[PDB]
Amino acid sequence: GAMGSMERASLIQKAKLAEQAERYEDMAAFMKGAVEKGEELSCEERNLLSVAYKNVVGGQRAAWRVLSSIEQKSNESEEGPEVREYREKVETELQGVCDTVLGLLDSHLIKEAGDAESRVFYLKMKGDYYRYLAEVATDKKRIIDSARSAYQEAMDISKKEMPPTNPIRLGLALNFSVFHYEIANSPEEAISLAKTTFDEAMADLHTLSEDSYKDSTLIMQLLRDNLTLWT
Amino acid sequence: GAMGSMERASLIQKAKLAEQAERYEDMAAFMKGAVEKGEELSCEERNLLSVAYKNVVGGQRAAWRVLSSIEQKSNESEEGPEVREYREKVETELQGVCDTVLGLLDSHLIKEAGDAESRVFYLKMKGDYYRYLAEVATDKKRIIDSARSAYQEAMDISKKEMPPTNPIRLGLALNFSVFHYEIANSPEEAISLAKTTFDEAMADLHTLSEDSYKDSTLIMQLLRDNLTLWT
Amino acid sequence: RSLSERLMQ
Amino acid sequence: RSLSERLMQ
Ligand SMILES: N=C(N)c1cc(-c2ccccc2)c(-c2cn(CCN)cn2)s1
Ligand SMILES: N=C(N)c1cc(-c2ccccc2)c(-c2cn(CCN)cn2)s1
Numbered sequence: 294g295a296m297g298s299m300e301r302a303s304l305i306q307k308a309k310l311a312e313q314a315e316r317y318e319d320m321a322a323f324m325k326g327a328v329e330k331g332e333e334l335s336c337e338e339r340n341l342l343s344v345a346y347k348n349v350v351g352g353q354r355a356a357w358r359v360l361s362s363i364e365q366k367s368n369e370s371e372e373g374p375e376v377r378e379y380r381e382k383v384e385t386e387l388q389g390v391c392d393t394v395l396g397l398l399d400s401h402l403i404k405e406a407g408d409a410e411s412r413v414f415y416l417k418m419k420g421d422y423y424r425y426l427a428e429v430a431t432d433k434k435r436i437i438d439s440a441r442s443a444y445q446e447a448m449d450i451s452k453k454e455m456p457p458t459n460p461i462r463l464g465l466a467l468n469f470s471v472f473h474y475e476i477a478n479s480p481e482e483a484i485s486l487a488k489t490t491f492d493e494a495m496a497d498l499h500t501l502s503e504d505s506y507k508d509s510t511l512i513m514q515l516l517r518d519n520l521t522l523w524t
Numbered sequence: 525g526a527m528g529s530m531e532r533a534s535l536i537q538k539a540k541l542a543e544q545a546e547r548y549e550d551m552a553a554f555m556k557g558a559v560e561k562g563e564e565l566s567c568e569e570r571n572l573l574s575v576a577y578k579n580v581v582g583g584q585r586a587a588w589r590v591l592s593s594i595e596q597k598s599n600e601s602e603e604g605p606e607v608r609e610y611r612e613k614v615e616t617e618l619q620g621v622c623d624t625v626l627g628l629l630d631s632h633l634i635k636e637a638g639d640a641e642s643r644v645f646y647l648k649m650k651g652d653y654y655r656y657l658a659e660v661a662t663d664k665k666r667i668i669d670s671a672r673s674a675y676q677e678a679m680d681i682s683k684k685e686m687p688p689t690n691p692i693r694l695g696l697a698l699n700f701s702v703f704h705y706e707i708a709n710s711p712e713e714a715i716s717l718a719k720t721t722f723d724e725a726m727a728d729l730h731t732l733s734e735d736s737y738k739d740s741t742l743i744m745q746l747l748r749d750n751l752t753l754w755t
Numbered sequence: 756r757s758l759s760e761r762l763m764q
Numbered sequence: 765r766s767l768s769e770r771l772m773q
């Protein structure tokens with residue numbers, strides 16, 4: 294890898310600099326290089342990895358949606374192959390980023406993650422990147438089931454090992470609820486999960502410090518916002 | 525070039541799609557491919573070229589400024605080479621984009637541009653991309669003089685061949701005034717140019733249609749905003 | 756479109 | 765920082 298000659302600590306430092314400079318492709322390359330050093334990632338490093346790739350794939354998803362909408366309009370309407378070709382180009386790039394992230398999780402972040410806060414984080418990530426693959430899949434069934442399976446394993450661990458207000462647990466449940474609503478054509482399951490997650494977190498807020506309360510309630514607000522959209 | 529196999533019209537179509545998708549690196553690659561077909565560019569195509577590269581270099585400049593500020597703070601303060609290395613990486617990329625644009629202008633857009641609206645546009649662009657090189661130069665004197673020379677040639681043509689409200693003429697004068705203030709340590713020249721440009725445009729607004737009036741006054745507002753900052 | 760988990764601000 | 769020419773909106 295092109296980052297093979299750079300020290301792990303320098304890759305982490307440069308990932309933080311790239312974040313400050315809003316250079317998320319660089320940030321993702323630095324964090325991929327850090328993962329490939331073979332050592333486990335700390336909490337801060339796991340979040341740097343996620344921030345970097347979420348920003349990269351987020352731009353790709355936004356572009357894909359614009360192009361897919363243009364393509365759908367063109368197929369009702371005067372024609373050429375260019376819209377499809379360019380949508381396909383962006384799609385292929387997006388799939389490549391998702392495959393890269395999934396590859397890092399499979400080689401070998403998940404297998405070395407034993408603590409709940411690392412293992413749930415990575416399994417959630419696996420679900421997320423399969424979900425992004427599912428958004429563009431048309432094949433789709435197995436990708437959907439791979440997302441589901443990863444989220445379910447993460448959920449099972451999170452419910453046993455984390456309090457209901459843990460931000461990773463909350464973010465996992467939020468994203469699994471989005472999976473149900475947007476991918477799996479299961480809006481009722483989405484609503485039920487969001488409601489139960491919100492209510493169980495509410496009941497655990499009393500145990501938290503002011504700073505943890507702020508973190509947990511911020512994520513709970515997204516569950517509430519989705520429930521408002523969905524009902 | 526990787527775009528050599530794509531039709532000119534398809535490259536232009538895809539540049540417009542890339543713009544809609546906010547995929548400016550793709551947009552710039554498509555427009556570079558279109559320029560390399562060897563035909564002159566229409567007004568719309570020249571603006572697509574500029575939009576694409578302005579967005580690419582704009583992100584690089586913003587990142588470079590963040591990193592340069594961090595580097596300057598570190599050199600007052602605990603140390604490693606990483607901030608300098610990463611600032612240098614971004615700088616080199618930025619210089620590469622500027623060199624690419626300058627290369628397109630030199631091979632062969634400027635030499636084939638005979639009408640004022642094309643020739644002034646390209647000479648202004650040449651000044652702009654030398655100015656972006658000057659922002660990071662530390663060598664700097666010759667880069668500054670290359671920017672100055674291109675802007676001056678554009679100004680001389682614009683004053684002879686375009687009305688004072690022409691948006692290219694206005695944008696040229698605006699950017700030459702920024703050059704004077706920010707690059708050439710000539711704030712008085714900047715102020716004088718902005719004032720004379722604004723006043724001569726004001727006096728020509730009466731000749732314009734409603735749509736041209738809106739275009740010209742929008743650019744005039746930037747001259748005014750700079751004059752407010754500079755005085 | 757539904758809201759998914761956000762990065763810490 | 766001074767304002768330079770903007771792209772048409
Ligand atoms: N440079 C960034 N973006 C980030 C840095 C950290 C961070 C992590 C540990 C220590 C200090 C900072 C982030 C973080 C933390 N958590 C978990 C609580 N929800 C989510 N993200 S994110
Ligand atoms: N797809 C884009 N961004 C743009 C398209 C056009 C355009 C140009 C000609 C005809 C139709 C559209 C642009 C333009 C025009 N002028 C000049 C007046 N100031 C500046 N920019 S920009």
Ligand SMILES: [Cl-]
Nearest residue numbers: 378379382538
């Ligand atoms: Cl394409």
Ligand SMILES: [Cl-]
Nearest residue numbers: 307609610613
């Ligand atoms: Cl670097």
Ligand SMILES: [Mg+2]
Nearest residue numbers: 299300301302
């Ligand atoms: Mg080492």
Ligand SMILES: [Mg+2]
Nearest residue numbers: 530531532533
């Ligand atoms: Mg042809």
